[PDB]
């Protein structure tokens, strides 16, 4: 929702940095000589940076050794195909994706090879455990930049993620429009929290991810990306328990579009049922168990299987957990619909209150000057004769006598 | 254009529900015993919902 407030970064900028280093003369030979004995090695390049190195396929020691003397049984044909197919598929994946592929496919790096790279990675055992149990997610957060094909090796860099922040508390915020419930059509006003998305504690502050679609979830673990995040103060959490706190100005979005919708949460469902829309919450055995009244309400997944709003049927998540309903007056009722700023996107609580004070200011001040600025006498008619003051008008003085 | 006015839903919620039902004990054996003869069958799970 607030994804526009994020910055713009270059993702593979690090890998490309290593990539251009391999273009230098002799740099590839250091790797070829390091991997001449074993299949995995550590190489410190010219710029001093140390990188892991891996040889996954050796067609040289096959074509030049097992295949060349015949060219100088049928099984040898199939054996070649099995050895060559990977080189073909790696080629195909590159030739489409313009040299940069993500996620890293199994052809580019098998699970055994990826677990080997994680095992030799220079980080803690906790990170090794995390990356080893969630290799599918690590693949989705990794890149494969094709570098060089120099005499006589093929090379591509696999840009792997480093999880510097682990085991800190996270929480996901879901929001939905909060409108009034009048009978007239255009008479309602609406308000919605825009800060929805993922939040995680990080270095005494909070990392906020407005595009929760980019954060991947496995069990209760959340793999987010700091590149598309925001570093907010710790006080941001107050917006959930006290939206009108002065120490943090919570962001909202105003409108007049009272449409009915539903937001499926992790353990329940929010239903904003406005207008003549019929919204229900149903159970797979009992049937309809709740008919929502006009307004924004909530229903937990404890015993509910479906939630229907209008012509839309949502299936709620059947995850195990305790859901608590916190009572409270909808804050939209705290506003007067006659001075409510209805065109606000990048807004906040204080911006709306200040536009209301400003809109209210001009009326009380215009009345404070104009009412009454007619308590004074105007200018007499500007003709030749003189005019005296009588009642509310300028009487011709010549009438005396 | 008005895509922001839309709600937020979980797409795979139903399939994942059936998935969590399939983790239960004996649930897989009912399927393996049902398909021991033919390749296609209709099976009613523990919660009564019938699935292909």
């Amino acid at each position, epitope marked *: 929702f607030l994804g526009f407030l994020l910055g713009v970064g270059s993702a593979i900028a690090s890998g490309v940095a290593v990539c251009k280093v391999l273009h230098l003369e002799g740099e590839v030979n250091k790797i070829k000589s390091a991997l001449l004995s074993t299949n995995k090695a550590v190489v410190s390049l010219s710029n001093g940076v140390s990188v892991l190195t891996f040889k996954v396929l050796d067609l040289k020691n096959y074509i030049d050794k097992q295949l060349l003397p015949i060219l100088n049984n049928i099984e040898t044909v199939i054996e070649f195909q099995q050895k060559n197919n990977r080189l073909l598929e790696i080629t195909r994946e590159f030739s489409v994706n313009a040299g940069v592929t993500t996620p890293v496919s199994t052809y580019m790096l098998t699970n055994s090879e990826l677990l080997s790279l994680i095992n030799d990675m220079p980080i803690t055992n906790d990170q090794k455990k995390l990356m080893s149990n969630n290799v599918q997610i690590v693949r989705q957060q990794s890149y494969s930049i094709m570098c060089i094909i120099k005499e006589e090796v093929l090379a591509y860099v696999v840009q792997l993620p480093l999880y510097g922040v682990i085991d800190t508390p996270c929480w996901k915020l879901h929001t939905s429009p909060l409108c009034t419930t009048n009978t007239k059509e255009g008479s309602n006003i609406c308000l919605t929290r825009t800060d929805r998305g993922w939040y995680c504690d990080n270095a005494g502050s909070v990392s906020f991810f407005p595009q929760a679609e980019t954060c991947k979830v496995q069990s209760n673990r959340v793999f987010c990306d700091t590149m598309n995040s925001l570093t907010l103060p710790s006080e941001v959490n107050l917006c959930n328990v006290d939206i009108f706190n002065p120490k943090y100005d919570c962001k909202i979005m105003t409108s007049k579009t009272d449409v009915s919708s539903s937001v499926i949460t992790s353990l329940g469902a929010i239903v904003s049922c406005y207008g003549k829309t019929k919204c229900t919450a149903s159970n797979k*055995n009992r049937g309809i168990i709740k008919t929502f009244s006009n307004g924004c309400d909530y229903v937990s997944n404890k015993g509910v299987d479906t939630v229907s709003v209008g012509n839309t049927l949502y299936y709620v998540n059947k995850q195990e957990g*305790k859901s608590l309903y916190v009572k409270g007056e909808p804050i939209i009722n705290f506003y007067d619909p006659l001075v409510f700023p209805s065109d606000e996107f990048d807004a906040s609580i204080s911006q709306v209150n200040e536009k209301i004070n400003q809109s209210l200011a001009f009326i009380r001040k215009s009345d404070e000057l104009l009412s009454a600025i007619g308590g004074y006498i105007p200018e007499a008619p500007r003709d030749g004769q003189a005019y005296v003051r009588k009642d509310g008008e300028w009487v011709l003085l010549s009438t005396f006598l | 254009f008005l895509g922001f006015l839309l709600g937020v839903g979980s797409a795979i919620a139903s399939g994942v529900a059936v998935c969590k039902v399939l983790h239960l004990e004996g649930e897989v054996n009912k399927i393996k015993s049902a398909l021991l003869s033919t390749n296609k069958a209709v099976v009613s799970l*523990s919660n009564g919902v019938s699935v292909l």
Partner: antibody, heavy 127, light 108 residues
Framework: EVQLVESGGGLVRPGRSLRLSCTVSGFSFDDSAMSWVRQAPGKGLEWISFIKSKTYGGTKEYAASVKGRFTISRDDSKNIAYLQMNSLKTEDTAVYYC??????????????????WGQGTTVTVSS | DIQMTQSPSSLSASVGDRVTITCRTSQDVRGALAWYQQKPGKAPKLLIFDASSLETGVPSRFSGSGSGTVFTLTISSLQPEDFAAYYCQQFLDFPFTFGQGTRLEIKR
């Protein structure tokens, strides 16, 4: 955190009256519905009464065995639920438990079980 | 009222055995069955709600099944803690009548 403490039991003559009081502590009392279930010595569980939340009216639902004799009520101002027992018989001698009805969702007038249970209070009716 | 009938009333079983209690109703309760565990003198504990849904904090060995008229509670691997009384309750309409009860004893 969540607790139901029923009180007011003890000895009472057959044909007299006794008022049980269930104090709720740990959650919102106004949003939740309360129920009374008793267990006679040696016998199984018997459902007695049920009072809905304020949101869904104030409907008191009793069982056939005590309908017309017992009366359930609630005081949301002090988070308490009463069970007024009138015209007591000797068969009413039992352990009285205070329970919370679990709505089929976060808030719904359909209940799937009795969530929280009090520890119970013993009521002996004998002359 | 809706009639509840539990079978059997008494059950003898050892530790690690697989037991199944049955609750028959008179009408179609639309899957509004509840299973409770009551140890002698102590308050009952809600084990299973809806038809098969498990209450939070209940071990995985407790399974609920059945539909319409017949409902089954199953304990896969018995433990010394599971020897108690078990009651089924209907939640279709009032009254929320209870079941007969099932005493679960240690076989000897």
């Amino acid at each position: 955190e969540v607790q139901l403490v029923e009180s007011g039991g003890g000895l009472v003559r057959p044909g007299r009256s006794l008022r049980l009081s269930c104090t709720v502590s740990g959650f919102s009392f106004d949003d939740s519905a309360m129920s009374w279930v008793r267990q006679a010595p040696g016998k199984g569980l018997e459902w007695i009464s049920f009072i809905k939340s304020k949101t869904y009216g104030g409907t008191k639902e009793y069982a056939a065995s005590v309908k017309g004799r017992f009366t359930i009520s609630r005081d949301d101002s002090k988070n308490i639920a009463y069970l007024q027992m009138n015209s007591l018989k000797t068969e009413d001698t039992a352990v009285y438990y205070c329970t919370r009805g679990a709505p089929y969702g976060g808030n719904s007038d359909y209940y799937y079980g009795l969530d929280v249970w009090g520890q119970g209070t013993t009521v002996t009716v004998s002359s | 009222d809706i009639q509840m009938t539990q079978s059997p009333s008494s059950l003898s079983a050892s530790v690690g055995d697989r037991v199944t209690i049955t609750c028959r109703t008179s009408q179609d309760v639309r899957g509004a069955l509840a299973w409770y565990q009551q140890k002698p003198g102590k308050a009952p504990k809600l084990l299973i709600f809806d038809a098969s849904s498990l209450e939070t904090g209940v071990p995985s060995r407790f399974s609920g099944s059945g539909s319409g008229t017949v409902f089954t509670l199953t304990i896969s691997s018995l433990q010394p803690e599971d020897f108690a009384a078990y009651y089924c309750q209907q939640f279709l309409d009032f009254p929320f009548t209870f079941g007969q009860g099932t005493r679960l004893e240690i076989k000897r």
